[PDB]
Ligand binder design. Structure first.
Ligand SMILES: CCCCCCCCCCCCCCCCCC(=O)OC[C@H](COP(=O)(O)OCCN)OC(=O)CCCCCCCCCCCCCCCCC
Ligand SMILES: CCCCCCCCCCCCCCCCCC(=O)OC[C@H](COP(=O)(O)OCCN)OC(=O)CCCCCCCCCCCCCCCCC
Lengths: 67, 317
């Protein structure tokens, strides 16, 4: 008279299938990308242009000597 | 004391390829929910000094049907260019100040495939005869995916030296203005240096066929050794090019501290890719170079030609 099945206490667990979490898609991407990339080239032309100014100063000390 | 500097660079890096083989599996182990080398270390840490001596005791046979002067010449050229490439590389001061050394990397990365063409031929038959011919074929095609987008940042750097490659990045961390090129920079070195997803080279390669298939543990001990010396060298080359650190002349000590921490992080990715993704089935490997990788690389090439002109932002040299 000592046998298994309980009178109660059950679930069940699902048979389902779901993890579609979105996700920042669909014109949200391709907009943060271009907005990041244009910040890069804007951070250029303030350094590459400025280094060309110091470049001419480096040639300047050459030319003020050599006679 | 120049000669004491060279030996101060070859010897402390053979530990870092021997203490990567141990971190090859501890990192790959906790992804599987299991501990590292548990019993011999105590923590593992003494594993490779025991795992090195066994190879040089175990009998180094040569195959009877093999050639002679080719089979024992490719491991000479294996460790030669795997260690010669570490020379012109600033941290913060390089050993050698080459005028143009970025090109010298491709002058060193080109000849490595000329040993695989030897060893696949030098020993024996079909499991490395034709099976290594189609390993030279993948490594040649990923230079034109490589050499173009290596040039595509030099239009913005200014010249060919590497001291300017740290000067131009004092305020930028240059992965941002070129992040499409930075993607295909990664996958190239992921497939050229013969690694895990694009893996018809080593051991995943029909899972039976490799260039390691015939070398007993005498000459084999370098092949693995030498090879692991490339993979921490494209990582030390990516992090001096895109993700450049800051140099201070009064404090060179704080350069390397903030530097070796970064090349280690990218080196983790070559381990962290292998525990996710399957192979590529040799057609689809090369089907995505021409058809898919290559026409974008010309597209950004024409983009990076005109954009320094139509910004009036010419880099000075
Ligand atoms: C199996 C064992 C038997 C084989 C043993 C021999 C194997 C040797 C294989 C080594 C192959 C490496 C060859 C690489 C050549 C490239 C060297 C180079 O270009 O160095 C860069 C530098 C350029 O000059 P620059 O940058 O302007 O200098 C700064 C000036 N302000 O140039 C310089 O700094 C100086 C240039 C002159 C230096 C001497 C010439 C260099 C080459 C000497 C070795 C000859 C090559 C041997 C054949 C190679 C075979 C693979
Ligand atoms: C107008 C202003 C200017 C506009 C600028 C706009 C900028 C846009 C930039 C776009 C260019 C950069 C993107 C590079 C292209 C991606 C490469 C590619 O095309 O892969 C295509 C590949 C082909 O397969 P598919 O077409 O999907 O067909 C099978 C479907 N059943 O399908 C694939 O997806 C393959 C995926 C890669 C294959 C290797 C995967 C192995 C693991 C690699 C992980 C790498 C992770 C990141 C790398 C490190 C990053 C730091």
């Amino acid at each position: 008279k000592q046998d298994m099945p309980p009178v109660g206490g059950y679930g069940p667990i699902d048979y389902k299938r779901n993890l579609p979490r979105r996700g920042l898609s669909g014109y949200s991407m391709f907009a943060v990308g271009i907005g990041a990339l244009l910040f890069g080239y804007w951070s250029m032309m303030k350094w590459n242009r400025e280094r060309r100014r110091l470049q001419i100063e480096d040639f300047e000390a050459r030319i003020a000597l050599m006679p | 004391m120049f000669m004491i500097n060279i030996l101060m660079l070859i010897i402390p890096i053979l530990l870092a390829v021997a203490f990567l083989t141990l971190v090859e599996r501890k990192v790959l182990g906790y992804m599987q929910l299991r501990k590292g080398p548990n019993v011999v270390g105590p923590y593992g840490l003494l594993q490779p000094i025991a795992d090195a001596i066994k190879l040089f005791i175990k009998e180094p046979l040569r195959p009877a049907t093999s050639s002679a002067s080719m089979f024992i010449l490719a491991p000479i050229m294996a460790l030669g260019l795997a260690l010669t490439m570490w020379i012109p590389l600033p941290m913060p001061y390089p050993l050698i100040n080459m005028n143009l050394g970025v090109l010298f990397m491709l002058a060193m990365s080109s000849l490595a495939v000329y040993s695989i063409l030897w060893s696949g031929w030098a020993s024996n038959s079909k499991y490395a005869l034709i099976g290594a011919l189609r390993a030279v074929a993948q490594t040649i095609s990923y230079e034109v995916t490589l050499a173009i987008i290596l040039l595509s940042v030099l239009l913005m750097s200014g010249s060919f030296t590497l001291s300017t490659l740290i000067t131009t990045q004092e305020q930028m961390w240059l992965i941002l203005p070129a992040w499409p090129l930075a993607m295909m920079w990664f996958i190239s070195t992921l497939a050229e240096t013969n690694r895990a997803p694009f893996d018809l080279t080593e051991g995943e390669s029909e899972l039976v066929s490799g260039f390691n298939v015939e070398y007993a543990a005498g000459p084999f001990a370098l092949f693995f050794m030498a090879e692991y010396a490339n993979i921490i060298m494209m990582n030390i080359f990516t992090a001096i090019l895109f993700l450049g650190t800051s140099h201070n002349p009064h404090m060179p000590e704080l350069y390397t501290i903030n530097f070796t921490i970064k090349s280690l992080l990218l080196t983790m990715s070559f381990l962290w890719i292998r525990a996710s993704y399957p192979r590529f089935r040799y057609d689809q490997l090369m089907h995505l170079l021409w058809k898919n990788f290559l026409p974008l690389t010309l597209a950004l090439c024409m983009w990076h030609v005109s954009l320094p002109i139509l910004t009036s932002g010419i880099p000075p040299q």
